[PDB]
Enzyme design. Sequence first.
Site, PDB file in Angstrom:
ATOM      1  N   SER A   2      -3.520   0.230  -4.674  1.00 38.53           N
ATOM      2  CA  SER A   2      -3.094  -0.906  -3.676  1.00 38.53           C
ATOM      3  C   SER A   2      -3.699  -1.874  -4.074  1.00 38.53           C
ATOM      4  O   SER A   2      -3.053  -3.067  -3.354  1.00 38.53           O
ATOM      5  CB  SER A   2      -2.368  -0.642  -2.541  1.00 38.53           C
ATOM      6  OG  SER A   2      -2.822  -0.204  -1.704  1.00 38.53           O
ATOM      7  N   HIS A  27       1.275   5.447  -2.401  1.00 38.57           N
ATOM      8  CA  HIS A  27       1.291   6.621  -1.948  1.00 38.57           C
ATOM      9  C   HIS A  27       2.853   7.239  -2.819  1.00 38.57           C
ATOM     10  O   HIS A  27       2.810   7.933  -2.845  1.00 38.57           O
ATOM     11  CB  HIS A  27       1.677   6.340  -0.293  1.00 38.57           C
ATOM     12  CG  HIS A  27       0.931   6.542   0.317  1.00 38.57           C
ATOM     13  ND1 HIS A  27      -0.687   7.724   0.783  1.00 38.57           N
ATOM     14  CD2 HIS A  27      -0.336   5.805   0.599  1.00 38.57           C
ATOM     15  CE1 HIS A  27      -1.531   7.616   1.240  1.00 38.57           C
ATOM     16  NE2 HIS A  27      -1.736   5.837   1.566  1.00 38.57           N
ATOM     17  N   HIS A  40       0.906  -1.782  -0.105  1.00 39.67           N
ATOM     18  CA  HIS A  40      -0.080   0.327  -0.189  1.00 39.67           C
ATOM     19  C   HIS A  40       1.076   1.311  -0.263  1.00 39.67           C
ATOM     20  O   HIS A  40       0.653   2.202  -0.553  1.00 39.67           O
ATOM     21  CB  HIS A  40      -0.686   0.019   1.066  1.00 39.67           C
ATOM     22  CG  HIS A  40      -1.957   1.218   1.218  1.00 39.67           C
ATOM     23  ND1 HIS A  40      -2.517   1.094   0.393  1.00 39.67           N
ATOM     24  CD2 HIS A  40      -1.453   2.431   2.092  1.00 39.67           C
ATOM     25  CE1 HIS A  40      -3.455   2.838   0.679  1.00 39.67           C
ATOM     26  NE2 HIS A  40      -2.962   3.286   1.903  1.00 39.67           N
ATOM     27  N   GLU A  90      -6.531   9.060  -0.394  1.00 38.92           N
ATOM     28  CA  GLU A  90      -7.019   6.828  -0.192  1.00 38.92           C
ATOM     29  C   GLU A  90      -7.928   6.930  -0.596  1.00 38.92           C
ATOM     30  O   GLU A  90      -7.409   5.773  -1.003  1.00 38.92           O
ATOM     31  CB  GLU A  90      -7.331   7.306   1.516  1.00 38.92           C
ATOM     32  CG  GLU A  90      -5.874   7.375   2.607  1.00 38.92           C
ATOM     33  CD  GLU A  90      -5.102   7.263   2.527  1.00 38.92           C
ATOM     34  OE1 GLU A  90      -4.263   7.642   3.128  1.00 38.92           O
ATOM     35  OE2 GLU A  90      -4.449   6.044   2.746  1.00 38.92           O
TER      36      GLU A  90
HETATM   37  N1  LIG Z   1      -7.670  -2.888   1.170  1.00 46.23           N
HETATM   38  C1  LIG Z   1      -6.194  -1.902   0.902  1.00 46.23           C
HETATM   39  C2  LIG Z   1      -5.407  -1.895   2.131  1.00 46.23           C
HETATM   40  C3  LIG Z   1      -5.833  -0.667   3.559  1.00 46.23           C
HETATM   41  C4  LIG Z   1      -6.721  -1.209   4.745  1.00 46.23           C
HETATM   42  N2  LIG Z   1      -7.351  -0.096   5.270  1.00 46.23           N
HETATM   43  C5  LIG Z   1      -7.352   1.342   4.286  1.00 46.23           C
HETATM   44  C6  LIG Z   1      -7.157   1.914   4.958  1.00 46.23           C
HETATM   45  C7  LIG Z   1      -6.317   3.393   4.457  1.00 46.23           C
HETATM   46  C8  LIG Z   1      -5.759   3.258   2.432  1.00 46.23           C
HETATM   47  C9  LIG Z   1      -5.612   1.690   2.156  1.00 46.23           C
HETATM   48  C10 LIG Z   1      -5.713   0.753   3.439  1.00 46.23           C
HETATM   49  C11 LIG Z   1      -5.415  -2.901  -0.009  1.00 46.23           C
HETATM   50  O1  LIG Z   1      -6.037  -3.839  -0.500  1.00 46.23           O
HETATM   51  O2  LIG Z   1      -4.267  -1.877  -0.430  1.00 46.23           O
HETATM   52 FE   LIG Z   2      -2.491   5.119   2.431  1.00 41.42          FE
END
Ligand SMILES: N[C@@H](Cc1c[nH]c2ccccc12)C(=O)O
Ligand SMILES: [Fe+3]
Length: 307
Positions: free
Chosen positions: A233, A174, A169, A214
């Site tokens: 991601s 980012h 991620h 995000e």
């Molecule tokens: N779901 C994202 C990871 C993630 C979980 N909770 C989050 C909150 C904000 C940003 C990213 C996330 C991924 O699979 O890559």
């Molecule tokens: Fe993030």
Amino acid sequence: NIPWYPKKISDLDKCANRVLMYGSDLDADHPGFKDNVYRKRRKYFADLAMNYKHGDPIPEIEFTEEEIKTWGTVYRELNKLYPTHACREYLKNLPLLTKYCGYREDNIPQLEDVSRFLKERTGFTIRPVAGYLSPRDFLAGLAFRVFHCTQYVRHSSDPLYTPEPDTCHELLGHVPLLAEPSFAQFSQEIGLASLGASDEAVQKLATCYFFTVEFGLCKQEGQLRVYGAGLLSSISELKHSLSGSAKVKPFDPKVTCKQECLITTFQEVYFVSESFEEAKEKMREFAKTIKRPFGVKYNPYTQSVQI
Ligand SMILES: N[C@@H](Cc1c[nH]c2ccccc12)C(=O)O
Ligand SMILES: [Fe+3]
């Protein structure tokens, strides 16, 4: 009464790693939480983050063959989708990462190397963190151009989606935009606006941050594209967002700031701006309406915040 906030870069050591954890604040039917053997591995990374002090090199990690294989699947599969799903500002800096950071399918970029690259490009550096960081502390980090990053890799059984942020991620969601001068400047501006604002004001700013940087969408030459790190991601959420069955609404801070931020599942709704520039602009103007009783600048030469 003004809440505590950091005044200089080393103050980020104070109450570091105030993070949301499985078994306390998070839950989901997903092996990244439920597989006991995987949780024991995750603790190796968490301990490293908990013992980090500003000025340390970021610990270099010996990843398992399994973890390297996961990074490889995520990297490979996402790169197939970026040309059709991601906004052009995101696509722009991808070749820099491969050329100047060693992004490769067979090797996970080390945070120390990525931090050095970013510092040179925009002055951003990385600090390792044990999990999803308290939104106030995450935004405070940005005011010093400090990006808090996880170092563990998601559970290998589900490359497609994970319910807490992992290193994939950070590195794929980012880093590309953080490498862009204008975006890095925008990031720090949002972080500076947050410093010592009320709990209610920060909650509103952080929610808008979540649904833009995000999970945000933007129009581009009449088409829907994605700029949100959390979509960029996730192989499955990235496709779903542009699948034609997702719920999509215009980004409007005064409405958006009331939406619940879902950490451990796909979002219920995505918010769209008329363009990527419009997204940043609406965010800057919203940050100014916070009603904080003082102003603040950053001095990059002393690495301190001036009131
Ligand atoms: N779901 C994202 C990871 C993630 C979980 N909770 C989050 C909150 C904000 C940003 C990213 C996330 C991924 O699979 O890559
Ligand atoms: Fe993030």
